[PDB]
Structure formats: C-alpha cells, structure tokens
Design a protein around this ligand. Structure first.
Ligand SMILES: OC[C@H]1O[C@@H](O[C@H]2[C@H](O)[C@@H](O)[C@H](O)O[C@@H]2CO)[C@H](O)[C@@H](O)[C@@H]1O
Length: 272
C-alpha cells in the first residue's frame, strides 16, 4: 500500500485546525480552499469559511516542517469566479505568484503573511476552458524560472472534463485528483462500482499527468452521491488501481468530514 492521501481544508469555520489536521499524519497534501472570487472586473478574494487568513501563516509553516505539502485551490464548487479575458489570466497569474508562491519582497500585502505555498490547485467547476490554458502557461513559465511549486487540478469524473479537459491535455499538471462523486455516470452507486471502474480506466489511461488520484467523499453527508465505504475501497478499488503506473493515492473531500468519519484512519489502519 503505502498510501498518499490529499485532503481539502477550509470548508468549515468549526473544523479541526490546519495544524491539527497536519499533525494527524494521515496526509501528504492539504489543499486550502477556496480563492473563489476573481475575474470580471473583480478583485481576488478568499472564501475559507471565516478562518483568519493571517492566522494560517504559522500553521502552514508547521505543516511544511512536518513534510506536508500545502496548496491553494482556485475556483471551487461555487463562486463568482471567471477568466474570460487574456488580461484576467495574466493578472491572476502574477497575483498568485507574488502573494503565495514567492517569499515576500517587503510586503504587508499577502493574505497568508510570509508563508510560501507549495502549489496551486485548479478546482474550476464552471466557465468552460476559457483562458485557463493561458493562466496555466504563465504559472508553468514561473515554475521554469526557478520557483519550484506544483500545479494540480480536480476535474469531475466524466472524461474529458468540460472545464479543464483541454488544459489537462497540455500535460501541465503534476497531479490530478478526479472527483468520483456527485455524478452517477462515473461514481459509485447502489452497490455497483461498474460506472466508477470504467471511469477510472479511462482517466488512468488517457490523462496526461504523472499522478492520478481517486477522489472520494469522506462521509455520506459530504456529497450528494458517490460515497463508498473504506472496506469496499480497499477491497474493490486498490487491487486494480495499484496496477496502474499512474496511481497516485486518494483524495478526500473533506477534512471537516474526515474528522467525523475517521475514513482516512480506516483506509490506513489507524496511523500515525
Ligand atoms: O490576511 C487577511 C485577513 O482576513 C481577515 O478576516 C476577514 C475575512 O477575510 C472576511 O471574509 C470576513 O468577512 O471578515 C474577517 C474578519 O473579521 C482577518 O480579520 C485578518 O486578521 C486576516 O489576516
């Protein structure tokens, strides 16, 4: 096994804190969501469910000191975000670079203070491809300029993804976590994994990335559909998934629900 688990954080004001989330030892990646406001004349804004952005500075550092990678996710399930013009792609690329991916020059400007993030997560669920290809190109260019960080995406389970499909085809993403929930055509339902198993084969064969993660909801309440019990994921999915060269591990939506279900603890055998 030796499983890598990625988990989304920032979805509830009352959730287990980021540092306690990393201290669990269950995750290789923690993804903070969401920068859900940008483009269309709008100034970029975060919706991290009321957590203090400045307060996350020491927590992000602690998480990193324990070898947990911290990512910022742009877009999200909901939000007034859009990248319709070329200028919007350029503006957001420059803003993400200065304020999150580079060490501060002087600055009082940065939301997370002096924390330097390990990457950007594309969680685009509406708006089509737009200028997301251009945005990724500039971010990819900065990565080639010496600032080492990761670019990831969280597409829906139908391939190709209507919003990120063309961008994923450029092979720019280091890792992809496919959301195998909220869509019966490609996720687990009614004691039937057929739709899920066929979606997985397609993504692991066609997705032009080095690592593909399987995204599951940590709890029945966490998503409309697609919840699959831990004992079934290990029995059903892992044997066929670990046969793939592109198998990355699993992604969990989300930290708040995982704390309640203890889903990651069961899939690993309680670790630690
Ligand atoms: O670095 C930024 C800054 O966030 C501030 O919190 C705001 C939050 O972003 C906003 O959405 C909400 O409506 O109000 C809160 C505060 O009362 C936070 O106050 C700052 O400490 C933090 O550093």
């Amino acid at each position: 096994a030796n499983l890598d688990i990625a988990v989304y954080w920032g979805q509830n004001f009352d959730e287990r804190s980021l540092e306690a989330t990393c201290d669990t030892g269950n995750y290789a990646y923690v993804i903070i969501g969401f920068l859900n406001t940008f483009g269309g004349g709008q100034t970029p804004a975060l919706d991290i469910s009321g957590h203090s952005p400045s307060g996350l500075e020491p927590q992000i550092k602690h998480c990193q000191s324990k070898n947990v990678k911290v990512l910022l996710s742009i877009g999200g399930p909901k939000g007034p975000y859009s990248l319709d013009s070329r200028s919007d792609a350029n503006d957001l690329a420059v803003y993400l670079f200065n304020n999150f991916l580079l060490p501060p020059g002087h600055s009082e400007n940065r939301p997370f203070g002096n924390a330097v993030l390990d990457g950007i997560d594309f969680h685009i669920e509406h708006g089509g491809p737009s200028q997301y290809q251009l945005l990724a190109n500039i971010l990819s260019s900065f990565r080639l300029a010496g600032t080492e960080f990761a670019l990831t995406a969280a597409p829906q389970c139908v391939y190709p993804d209507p919003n990120l499909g063309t961008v994923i085809n450029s092979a720019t993403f280091d890792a992809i976590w496919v959301q195998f929930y909220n869509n019966p055509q490609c996720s687990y339902s009614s004691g039937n994994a057929e739709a899920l198993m066929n979606a997985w084969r397609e993504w692991s064969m066609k997705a032009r990335t080095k690592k593909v993660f399987l995204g599951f909801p940590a709890h029945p309440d966490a998503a409309g559909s697609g919840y699959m019990p831990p004992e079934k994921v290990k029995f059903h999915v892992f044997p066929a998934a670990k046969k793939s060269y592109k198998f990355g591990g699993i992604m969990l939506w989300d930290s708040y629900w995982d704390t309640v279900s203890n889903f990651s603890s069961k899939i690993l055998g309680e670790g630690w």
